[PDB]
Amino acid sequence: QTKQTALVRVENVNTREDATWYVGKRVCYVYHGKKVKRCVRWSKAPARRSTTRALWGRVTRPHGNAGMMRVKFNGASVPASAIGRRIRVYLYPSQI
Amino acid sequence: KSHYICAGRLVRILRGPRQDRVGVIVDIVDANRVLVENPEDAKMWRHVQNLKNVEPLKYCVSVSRNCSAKALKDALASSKALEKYAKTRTAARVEAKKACAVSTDFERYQLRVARRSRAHWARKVFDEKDAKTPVSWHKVALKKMLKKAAKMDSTEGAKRRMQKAIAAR
Amino acid sequence: VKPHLRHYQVVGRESPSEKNPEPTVYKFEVFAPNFVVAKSRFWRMMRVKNKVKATHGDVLSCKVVKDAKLVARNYLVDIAYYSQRCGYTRMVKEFRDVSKTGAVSQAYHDLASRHRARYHNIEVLNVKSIPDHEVKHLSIAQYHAPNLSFPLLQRRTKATRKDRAIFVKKNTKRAVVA
Amino acid sequence: KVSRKSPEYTTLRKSCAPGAIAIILAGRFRGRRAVILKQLPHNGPLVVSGPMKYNGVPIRRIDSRYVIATSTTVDISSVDTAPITAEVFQRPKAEKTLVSDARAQLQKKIDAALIAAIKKDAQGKEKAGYLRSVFTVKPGDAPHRWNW
Amino acid sequence: AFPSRKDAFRAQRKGAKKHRPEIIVIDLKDHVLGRAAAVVAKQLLLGKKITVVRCEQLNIAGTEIRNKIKYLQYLRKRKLTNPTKGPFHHRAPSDVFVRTVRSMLPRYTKRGMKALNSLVAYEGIPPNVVRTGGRVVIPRAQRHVCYRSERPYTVLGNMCKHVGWKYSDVVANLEKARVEKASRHHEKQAKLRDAWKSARKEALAKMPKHNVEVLKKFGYA
């Protein structure tokens, strides 16, 4: 395997044309750590402080003919502990 | 009874670029292929269709195999098969699917309030009827315990506990 | 699906020389995937019949013969193939199709499945449309009935590709995983 | 012909026109519907305010990549939109709910004209209810196949 | 399985309500064994929690004798020097399906065992699954779309009963009682079902007229 690129399957996206609609969308993987560490708006919004963490990526291209998508994460690679776990595919950047 | 594949049989295209269009069998090549044509549809000129891609309908026009284009048009108009087909529920559903596919966000909102409004009024009607003849879980259970509760609550001891603790409120 | 072989007409001759200043011109009928295969089949025919090599000849035309209008017809395909065990085997077969190319393409598939014959071991002698009254095989003649009707049974109808689902509720059409 | 250094330069897509009803995709008011009022100069962010009475969305600037601009629109020629300037959204620098009176007055005036504009527009009652509805991604939804 | 006292104490301190994970329940009756296993194995690797019922009604192509001999050839494979810790041949139809799924997973990795441990198999439909929700099927693994109906096929329970499975009669008796109980319950609640049907039909005359036209446009009236 080459871990710099990840494969994400999205519900109701089962065609290559369906997967092309999501090219460029921002992708987020949400997990939690053991301790509360720094986050966005740590001082602005103290309610956001949590063990919850997110890794952010983007859809680069479709994969195959069945709506599979290729996702590249920001800088690093997604952990292998995320295999089989939930991936969030947002609707921005919007093209509509 | 299933509708046979025969000359003059009306079919609906299942998949492909002509999906959900109606044509007439006109001729049978072999066990796998036919020659569909529909004069009233622009994209439905005479062409070959695989029998796995057609759905026979309950209407058959009276044409011979390899009938002329004029003869098919006259038979299609005289039999009124297209007019009859358009009044069925499945034909309406196909039109409904096309309307939803090209719908906008505003029309999707309009359908949402239309279905919610019907849902609200169905509950109003159901609850009014459930009051007369109990059919739900709460109204049937309430009826099942009214007779026992009335018998037990009508005792002198129960009535003393009625007022002595209601007055505290 | 459209036929995988096209009807080609190749016209060619031996290149003129001192010995043969006015060479004969030959017209060739062949069903090939492309015109390069059509030209290859033409020079093979020229070599084994007229003793003329491609290096000593030229092609006058390699056009495609257009199909007629699509009508359900009976096609009589005269075809032959080579096997090591039995040499050359020539047969005459009847097919139901809408074009000459479709009938010949269906003939190649038939020979490939019932006799394991590939394209380059097969020669098509002739193909023609014949009337219903000259059809001998009952498997073909059964399609000439004036009132031919049959139901569609044991049919696997797949959903549209966009609407296909993995898990569906048992007696409904609601997709659970799709 | 419009110079890039000029403040009127814009590469905004035609769907994000003033008056278009947009779905807010990100931020505090995600899932709400708002009306696009204008685009700030120098190809700046859009300014949207779905009437704060209808959905609670105030006069706020938003990047055009974080909205879905729907085809259903509202006539905004009657709404001024002139006093919505970039300097309205700036803040003084600090060192080491509350709404300014100028901001509150701007919201009250803009929303009054915006609400009036919606009423005149045919199917104005439906569009007012449309501006109240919350957009959510449901199980089984396929927004990639939808038309907006 | 049985919750610990610490786990119960923590839940009461948290004050949470009853929790059920999102579980897909598949009715495996008249499903091709291999095609159902391949589809389920991929879904397990994608993080789905799957429970399969009526495993005794799975189907394999071919005559029962041919598939019985196939199992008996598998049964004869055992470590000669020590049959313990040898291949363990499970006779129950639910364990046969589980073994089929296991061979379609990377069973010797932690990720593969996480997928395998997310699958629960049953013979028939046990009471804890009856009322959990509607059952699903796998359209691409169903017998009537996969086999040509002329070819003989075997039912997994019939094959398993003659190679060592001892609970064929117990499952049949339990399944008979379940269907009678479900039929009696479904024979009841008919009045409730028709009451809501008339409420939806009568509600058309009470809603605003323009809302009815919208319903008719999208084929809901």
Place this chain on the structure above:
RNA sequence: AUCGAAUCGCCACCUACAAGACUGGAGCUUGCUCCCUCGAAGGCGCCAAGUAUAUUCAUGAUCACAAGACA
């Protein structure tokens, strides 16, 4: 009680059954015609408890794990 977490569709209408060589019901002519509920939707849920007379939302300042989640 540490404990901050990842999870994001509810139901007391699906949560009963069986068959795809034929399961809405008839006729005789056995593949056509006729009747019907017309044979291609489990119901809800998506921001006024319902389609209207309405009503707090900001400064959480342009994305950031939804800053919240007993529907």
Place this chain on the structure above:
RNA sequence: UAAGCCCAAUUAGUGAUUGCCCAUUAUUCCUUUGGUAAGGGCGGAAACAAAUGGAGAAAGUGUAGCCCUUCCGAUGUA
């Protein structure tokens, strides 16, 4: 109703000639290194204190390579 064999296609009698997946290969971009390497610059142009544009510029095989541009090759037991 193969996930078997023979043949034949690329979303299919619709409207034309690239379905998809994997390399230390190909193309291209960045960096290194070595050339049978290919070229430019090297007579300080002029002006300019701090408190509040900068620095360098070696006639050179090889260095922290005088600097810059360009092209090609790069695995390997004895």
Place this chain on the structure above:
RNA sequence: GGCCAGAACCAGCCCUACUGCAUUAUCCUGUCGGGGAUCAAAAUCCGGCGGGCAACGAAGUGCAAGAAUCUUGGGUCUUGG
């Protein structure tokens, strides 16, 4: 701020959209005769003659050079600003 992130624009690449020229005739039509099968026809089929563009997105046939500026496509966390 030499940190993180998002949007803008540039230059360069990489992608996709929008297509013209040529060619059909063993072809397209009408009509006459034959032949065919029908309750009777028609059609599949073969000849004679007369017309011709099968032109709907005609053909899945040879070659296509269509400035993504017009008419604001996409990517570049695969480059540098």
